């Protein structure tokens, strides 16, 4: 039977223990998500308390990280989602995504309505991925792809 959480700190504590294990084993997130059938981002978001793993993926990543039974079971719980400590990120890496919203949120609204119509892009019916790409000027670029279903507001 589906089980769900109501206090994010139970899964966030476990996130921290997972990350300590990961480090001691010198693991990558790519290699933890290998063999689960599930994208890097999805599996990583789960370890970090933001998705549920199916029973088999839970058992497999739990094997790779030496997790007790209670942990493997926590990973299959539907989480109380929300990874930002207090609304606005302090961490520069995370912050720059928030800054993208402070610069473009209204343009994104404006252009979503023009191209699709009244309503929203889903973050539920949704995938993302992060791709490292060569910058043609030297260095590297991240291509983060947000792929969500257009959901129209339709009048009643």
């Amino acid at each position: 039977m589906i089980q769900s959480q109501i206090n994010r700190n139970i899964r966030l504590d476990l996130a921290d223990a997972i990350l300590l294990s990961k480090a001691k084993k010198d693991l990558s997130f790519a290699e933890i998500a290998d063999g689960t059938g599930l994208a890097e981002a999805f599996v990583t978001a789960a370890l970090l308390g933001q998705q549920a793993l199916p029973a088999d993926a839970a058992r497999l990543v739990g094997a790779k990280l030496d997790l007790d039974e209670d942990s493997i079971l926590l990973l299959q719980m539907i989480p109380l989602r929300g990874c930002i400590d207090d609304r606005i990120p302090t961490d520069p890496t995370m912050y720059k995504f928030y800054e993208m919203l402070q610069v473009y949120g209204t343009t994104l609204k404006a252009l979503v309505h023009e191209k699709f119509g009244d309503g929203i892009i889903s973050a539920i019916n949704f995938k993302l991925d992060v791709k490292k790409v060569a910058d043609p000027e030297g260095g590297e670029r991240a291509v983060i792809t947000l792929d969500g279903k257009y959901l129209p507001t339709k009048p009643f």
Copy 2:
């Protein structure tokens, strides 16, 4: 000589004036960006107060929207950027982007450090586009691509 703003309300007031004129003339953002050299997202951001237009583009959009000279000039100022009224958006369209951060923010961090290293994805060396694609299962998907340069932290 480059000129800059310190109070966002001046450009955000102009943005409202622009949208009314835009509505009266029944224009699209695609049409307004036509003949500027500049991507739709970049030109939309500027009208909405989040980017400067070069003089030529400013005159060009300004003639389309029948803007006065002060307005054409304001559009060339470097803005006091920040489009969200009060940190967290109320508007469902804008809010879903914020929610993507609440679900994936720590995943984006984790994976950025794994793939690139210690540093950040730029919001300044950056590009975004919004693309509509049909959904195999019916409907339209929005694919929003955030494209930023990786900037490493290096020890000193």
Copy 3:
């Protein structure tokens, strides 16, 4: 061409003007929505800056309330949604709905997960209605029906 807002105050200023005109003419919301083809909840929300009316409905309610042409046009814009002044309602009537969330919000989470799965009830593919019902123990009850599409989260 679809036109969208970015500053809630334009439509909220217009809502206040509409509400004064309404009261001068001694109209109900029922009678303003009558003839539009649209549900009284929808037309009301539109008046109050939270939905867009189609042009014909905008002209009808325009004529009823004696609104000018720019006002009828504003009523057709896709709003910057968000009716609460500062996140938490101060008004007792509005506040009690919030209070229902403070009491039942985790129970709603738990029961959505058990009855539907991992995901959300949509507020976009959505309708609500308010019905007066006699209370067998004297007086009147409000039955408020919130009706939204289940959107699952599925792993990727």
Copy 4:
């Protein structure tokens, strides 16, 4: 003799103990509420620290979840209600109920005053239920019914 709580953290910690014991036993909220004489939504709220169970119900559920006597006693205490961590939910499932308020809160005010009068719909003399039903267009909808007593403001 009636007993009451002043710090939510005591029943919320108990909430988390309950959900782990629930998860370990692979129980459902429906089967914990069975035999209590009480709605599923009522008993769940109580598990999650938002209502008091009567001693008979507290004893029945405590023996389902193997809880100690101090816990069975806590469940009968009148709680310090408020399930939301910091005012605005971060969890998308919970958040969408809040989003319903951001969009329709003033419509609900307007329509309660129109249909009932000056006053409020009670969150106390109140019930709720959640039903799953097929959507004629395909998929499933949730029907959440909020059923409260109208309490008039009467002048003095």
Copy 5:
């Protein structure tokens, strides 16, 4: 037909107009409420935008303050209630009532539960009055009486 507001500022602006008028006429609130059939605190609350006046009362107080027709009309509207600018009062006279809550809030909960049970003291079915008495050790005391209906929460 009943009419209601959704932005407190329209009625708060009218409050400031009422009070300038009152000052110029050197009127008290006792005198404005006289002949109204309504308690001083009720009529005052209404002038200050926190209650609605019946039509006769509104015309009567408007006669005494020389208010235009729209104003007399605004006083009959159901207000968007909430007199505190930004949640916590800055003004020392108002702040003390807030302080009484910081000191006695939890005692009031405890003693409401013990004396009545699980539920709330109504703020809607409610009367308020302020009485000046002599202090036995010299000076004056304020005896403020909050008189609200007990509404139990009962299981469902």
Copy 6:
């Protein structure tokens, strides 16, 4: 010699222990303050961390609740007062009192200045009591009396 706290959490954890003790022994707040020479509301506030008990009261309540000697001593310190977790109450019982302030707070200011003059009603030279009184329309009413010294501002 007089002893005082600077962090509310010491006394509030103590309150949680007191309430647990109290619940086991199935005591009321009536019976705990009995024998104390002090008003029910004063003694309850003290147990809840919002008042100091004198040593004899501290001893008498400590024997009834079976508290250790360090606790009986803590009960005697002058508290770091402030019972609301985070400024606004989430609990519907405590919240109605905050709502009374949102509706009537400016009316209280206004009427205080009219009856007494420029200054404040004391919450330190203060008492409160709660009484049940049957409502002749049916059920029960809570009559809460707030009784505070008037303290004028006088120019200097």
Copy 7:
């Protein structure tokens, strides 16, 4: 009859007009307060919207600053007090008094409870002055005296 305000902006806008007049005329606060029978801290605070001037004083300053009669009448009304824009000063001169509270706030408490007892030092029955006095080590110090009554807290 005493008149009072409920919106601070009305008196704060007047403070701004007073200050520009005061500058045009190159006046000091000492000169404005002279011949008034009142301390410069008191009179200045009134001009700044935080105290009420008695009628005589009000007419005296109003003459100095060339104020209209509505402004002289406003200076006699009882203000909605609170001079800090948003809880915490941004101004370095003002902020430093706030920093004195962050460093020494708990000490002040501890030492008021030691020297006087349970209770508070008044900000209402209160005098304030500011002296420039040379520093024996060189330069100038500021000596600011907060002279307030001790208001005890005792059982009931």
Copy 8:
């Protein structure tokens, strides 16, 4: 070698242990500071985590309160200063000093600039004392003196 803190809770936890010890032994702050050569306000602020003791003072107060060597050493650390839990005090005693700033804050600024000039009054080159002075009209007055160097701003 000078040592400093970055997390206030280490010294604030110690502060609570000091106060429990102080109470158990029934000491006063005047007697803890006596023999130290240091002003009572200074020594008290250090005990409460807002100043650092020199090593001999740290040893001397540690003897009187029976503290361990880890504690005595902590007392000598330069603290992370900030005694107010969350910006605005909840405690009536501490709050009144905050209210003094809400009333007199702009006046203190206006009178600093008049009497000294453009700059600030120091909270660092600063002392404060608290004297009891009986009132001509009866009871006692607290005369708190804030004595800080004046630091001008001057153009560069």
Copy 9:
């Protein structure tokens, strides 16, 4: 006589006026500060409402920007300082100085105490300059130098 401000919006509104004027005349801050005797950073801060100009400088920049006499006089007032609209900057250029404090805040504390001792670095006895230095690796750096006086805290 020294004249000071107490509402930042008067000088910030002027700041905007100055900025439009500046842009119309296509002037740099470098050139406006020329001839005033004052550092470009000082003169710019003044224009932006964060410093006062001496009469002569105010009349010079006044001539340059075509300001009227009330303005030239506002430029000479001691401002109510604080340039950030709502505590945390939204603008990427201003935000990165805030991020400097989030990353290095505690390091600056720790190193200040190690190198100078207990106390602060002044932001009043202070100056800053911004200098463009070529980066060896390609492009440009800004070297921003903050030059403040060490003000010790020492006991009393």
Copy 10:
């Protein structure tokens, strides 16, 4: 393989442990960073949880401070950065750098755009140093140099 953190408290707790060890051994930060290859500001930031140490440096400082292996590993993780407890610093030493931003933030934007163009100064590609210079007038000045790469904004 690179390891990163998502919860600042793990490393902020280690920072507290480091500082106590550091206190006990009476070390300075200059000594701890000696032999590290790395600047003092860089290494201190790392101990305080705001930078990652390369393995050799981690091993060195761990030896000096007697840190266990889990700790030496932690210091190599990429941190969840953000040293400020709750956005605005309470500590006077930290606070003055925040005030520099409230006074000069917009001046820094302005001069950055004039001297470099549209864009930001990096806090990532960044060096920071703190130096003591004798004050020609008497005492010591702190010169903090912030040295960051300029990152331009250009249209796409």
